[PDB]
Amino acid sequence: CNTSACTQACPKVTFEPIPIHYCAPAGYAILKCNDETFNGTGPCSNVSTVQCT
Amino acid sequence: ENLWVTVYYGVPVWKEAKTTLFCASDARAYEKEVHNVWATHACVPTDPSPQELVLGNVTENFNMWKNDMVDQMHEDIISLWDQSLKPCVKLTPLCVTLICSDATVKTGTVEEMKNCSFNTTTEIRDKEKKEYALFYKPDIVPLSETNNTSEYRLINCNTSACTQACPKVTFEPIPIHYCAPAGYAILKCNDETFNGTGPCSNVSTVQCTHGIRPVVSTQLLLNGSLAEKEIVIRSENLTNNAKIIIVHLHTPVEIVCTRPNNNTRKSVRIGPGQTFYATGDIIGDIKQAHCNISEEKWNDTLQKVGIELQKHFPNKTIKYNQSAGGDMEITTHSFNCGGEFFYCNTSNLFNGTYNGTYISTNSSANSTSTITLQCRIKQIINMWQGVGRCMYAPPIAGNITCRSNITGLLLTRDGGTNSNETETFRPAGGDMRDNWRSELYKYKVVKIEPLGVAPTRCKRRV
Amino acid sequence: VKTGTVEEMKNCSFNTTTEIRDKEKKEYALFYKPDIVPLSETNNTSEYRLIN
Amino acid sequence: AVGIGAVFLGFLGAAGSTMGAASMTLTVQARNLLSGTVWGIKQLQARVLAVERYLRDQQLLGIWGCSGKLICCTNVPWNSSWSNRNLSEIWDNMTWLQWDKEISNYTQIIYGLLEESQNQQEKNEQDLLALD
Amino acid sequence: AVGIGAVFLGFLGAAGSTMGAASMTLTVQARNLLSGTVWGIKQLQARVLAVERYLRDQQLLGIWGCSGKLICCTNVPWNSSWSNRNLSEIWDNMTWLQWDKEISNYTQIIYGLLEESQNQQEKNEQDLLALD
Ligand SMILES: *[C@@H]1O[C@H](CO)[C@@H](O[C@@H]2O[C@H](CO)[C@@H](O)[C@H](O)[C@H]2NC(C)=O)[C@H](O)[C@H]1NC(C)=O
Ligand SMILES: *[C@@H]1O[C@H](CO)[C@@H](O[C@@H]2O[C@H](CO)[C@@H](O)[C@H](O)[C@H]2NC(C)=O)[C@H](O)[C@H]1NC(C)=O
């Protein structure tokens, strides 16, 4: 009552983390850096193409 | 000799038809992070390019009154206004019995406000404490037939509920460019002497329209477009006196209004995480809000409009009279400035006559002469009908200045009788359609039929 | 009713809030029996509630 | 004139001119049929835009036996009953708007005949090629 | 190599190879331009997808005078000022990415010239056929 109101979450819905595959739409492509020693910023000498993550 | 069919794709042909338009605005609105008008939220960044290309030799018919673009603009504005108030606090636990007394500020007394006290619920769901606030008289109504002068109620609960507008959103008019979608074209009548209905001998094609100010007014038109050459009169038909006459101006007329009261805001918290603002104490001497217009410029404009109107009514002189009256929202010049709604009286302005005798105002004996008007203020507003009309405008600290320009007027014929030699005109407002139709008369929308056929001396090779 | 009596309706009176947020006045209305249910186990025949 | 060089005649700069001069530079009229960006349901509703009418035009043109968004001469005879007018008065000093106004009453029959003429020619060519 | 037989090179399996080898198997790149199913307003907004860009490409290709989503040789002369490079160094040992990087600064003029070249050729052919 000092910041905002509240709401109760439904009981039948769970918060378990289900894996989600992020896929790209047609007309775009997803490139994946296959190098396992990648520092985070820089080029990769082995780049693959993936449909969905 | 013999001729055969041939099909052409891309032939320019125009067909007037209905469609939908998009809105665009300058990128300056997008600069604001949040709470900057509605153009940044609902419209696209624009571009002046391409220029208005002029066609070589064309002929077209333009109609101003028989158009649907104004209706679409009105619907879009209504939808935007309705949507904008959804998240803001809607109040409701505030129409309790108010105990109101005469306002007595430390510096004196004020007749336009009442000091109403009432119980309000605190952060606790069931717990009440007393609070006080100053309210304007028009928003106060006696409760019941029982003549108990100590009890009052807001002017509400008899028509519909109310909602408070958010404080971080402003009502400043940002120009909007109405552009057409692909497959349709916008034609513009370049003639500056166009009466409103008829053809134009110089028609151009435009990508998007110029800036349009979504302003609200009843009697006069605020800052906006200007005439190119001279004053032009537009009317649906002069046979019927009920129609509204729109008059343009060759030059603007300055106007400045102010409220020096220097009010201050309170902070009353009701419910979980939502507050209601109201005017509390007043610091400084009590004065009256006012409006200011120049006299010589107004008289010159009135004489110019009169001589321009003499062509349609050469056998009669010209006179002006006070408005019809009635409700405040009808007969009063209602407008907005900085979130504050002002209702001015034009009785002192529309009072004069002209019999064709032009009077020169080049003497300039006293350049400081001016005409002053007294105005009232309201918080509860019913902008339109059946849109959730009730709206609450929160107050603002300090005193404001609303310098602006006048470039148009709305007039109406009076009921003639006895073949009077001095038939008059009266101010008269109405729906915003009249206001928005004066700035969209040039533009028309057409659909393209690129396919065509024609004969020629050719045949298909086998 | 003035013309007689009806078995399929009951004359229920209750307090309702007026235009004022906190102010109540008595009102009456006729309601069909299936939409009327006894309130609680306490057998007080003068009290009833909607089937809701 | 049409001898500008690099064409920048805009969307409808050639309208109102003669048929011969306006015959060229037809590409700009057809090319400019795309614009807009998302705001709300109505914007996406309107964003179908020319994608439907362009496909309609492509279907009508391809069925008649024409490839490419340019001129295409057919073999249907021109029955003089429709116009019965001089060639010079149409192709030299008349614009497309008034011509379409005059000839707007005879659109269905010509399209219907062109629909089957192309199919007949295609079948005849197929038979000729299959005979060998 | 390109002699696989039944092509299953994926969407971009030929990228990074030589121009001659990568010249073939261009159909797979163009064909795979459709996917998705409805969820909410944003999904349908994105479902315009390649329908707009594909139509853009079709308009640009058809205006230039080419039918079919394959190679198409034009008649515009190749001004050496753009590249001034040996033929062998481009068509045998260079990939498309770096070539596009090099030649990305001269796209507007060539498209503009190709737009009017096809119209000129079409009008000349129409006049030649109409003369008889
Ligand atoms: C309007 O009336 C209210 C009371 O109904 C005034 O509030 C009281 O003012 C006195 C004197 O300043 C204080 O002692 C009380 O504590 C105030 N009451 C509350 C609940 O705060 C209010 O000052 C009046 N308005 C003005 C402008 O004076
Ligand atoms: C509050 O009212 C005062 C008096 O009406 C205003 O005073 C002047 O306003 C002009 C407006 O341009 C300023 O340029 C002056 O500096 C102000 N002071 C004086 C002494 O003239 C004042 O502007 C009003 N407040 C606001 C915010 O406009």
TrEMBL record, chain A:
The disulfide bonds in this chain are: C23-C52, C33-C44
Glycosylation site residues: N2, N39, N46
Q: What is this protein called?
A: Envelope glycoprotein gp160
Q: State whether it acts alone or in a complex, and with which partners, per the record.
A: The mature envelope protein (Env) consists of a homotrimer of non-covalently associated gp120-gp41 heterodimers. The resulting complex protrudes from the virus surface as a spike. There seems to be as few as 10 spikes on the average virion. Surface protein gp120 interacts with host CD4, CCR5 and CXCR4. Gp120 also interacts with the C-type lectins CD209/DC-SIGN and CLEC4M/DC-SIGNR (collectively referred to as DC-SIGN(R)). Gp120 and gp41 interact with GalCer.
User: What family is this?
Assistant: Belongs to the HIV-1 env protein family.
Q: How is it modified after translation?
A: Palmitoylation of the transmembrane protein and of Env polyprotein (prior to its proteolytic cleavage) is essential for their association with host cell membrane lipid rafts. Palmitoylation is therefore required for envelope trafficking to classical lipid rafts, but not for viral replication.
- Entry's localization field: Host cell membrane; Host endosome membrane; Virion membrane
Gene of this entry: env
Additional comment? Inhibitors targeting HIV-1 viral envelope proteins are used as antiretroviral drugs. Attachment of virions to the cell surface via non-specific interactions and CD4 binding can be blocked by inhibitors that include cyanovirin-N, cyclotriazadisulfonamide analogs, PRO 2000, TNX 355 and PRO 542. In addition, BMS 806 can block CD4-induced conformational changes. Env interactions with the coreceptor molecules can be targeted by CCR5 antagonists including SCH-D, maraviroc (UK 427857) and aplaviroc (GW 873140), and the CXCR4 antagonist AMD 070. HIV-1 lineages are divided in three main groups, M (for Major), O (for Outlier), and N (for New, or Non-M, Non-O). The vast majority of strains found worldwide belong to the group M. Group O seems to be endemic to and largely confined to Cameroon and neighboring countries in West Central Africa, where these viruses represent a small minority of HIV-1 strains. The group N is represented by a limited number of isolates from Cameroonian persons. The group M is further subdivided in 9 clades or subtypes (A to D, F to H, J and K).
Would you say which domain of life the source belongs to? Viruses
- Domains: what does the record tell us? The CD4-binding region is targeted by the antibody b12. The 17 amino acids long immunosuppressive region is present in many retroviral envelope proteins. Synthetic peptides derived from this relatively conserved sequence inhibit immune function in vitro and in vivo.
The species this protein belongs to is: Human immunodeficiency virus type 1 (HIV-1)
From TrEMBL, chain C:
Q: Describe, as the record does, how this protein assembles with itself and its partners.
A: The mature envelope protein (Env) consists of a homotrimer of non-covalently associated gp120-gp41 heterodimers. The resulting complex protrudes from the virus surface as a spike. There seems to be as few as 10 spikes on the average virion. Surface protein gp120 interacts with host CD4, CCR5 and CXCR4. Gp120 also interacts with the C-type lectins CD209/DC-SIGN and CLEC4M/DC-SIGNR (collectively referred to as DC-SIGN(R)). Gp120 and gp41 interact with GalCer.
Sites carrying sugar chains: T3, N11, N15
Q: Could you tell me what this protein does?
A: Transmembrane protein gp41: Acts as a class I viral fusion protein. Under the current model, the protein has at least 3 conformational states: pre-fusion native state, pre-hairpin intermediate state, and post-fusion hairpin state. During fusion of viral and target intracellular membranes, the coiled coil regions (heptad repeats) assume a trimer-of-hairpins structure, positioning the fusion peptide in close proximity to the C-terminal region of the ectodomain. The formation of this structure appears to drive apposition and subsequent fusion of viral and target cell membranes.
Indicate the span of the full protein covered.
132 to 183 of 847
Protein localization: Host cell membrane; Host endosome membrane; Virion membrane
Region forming the signal peptide: none
Protein name as annotated: Envelope glycoprotein gp160
**Domains: entry comment:** The CD4-binding region is targeted by the antibody b12. The 17 amino acids long immunosuppressive region is present in many retroviral envelope proteins. Synthetic peptides derived from this relatively conserved sequence inhibit immune function in vitro and in vivo.
Q: What protein family is recorded?
A: Belongs to the HIV-1 env protein family.
Gene giving rise to this polypeptide: env
Modification note: Palmitoylation of the transmembrane protein and of Env polyprotein (prior to its proteolytic cleavage) is essential for their association with host cell membrane lipid rafts. Palmitoylation is therefore required for envelope trafficking to classical lipid rafts, but not for viral replication. Highly glycosylated by host. The high number of glycan on the protein is reffered to as 'glycan shield' because it contributes to hide protein sequence from adaptive immune system.
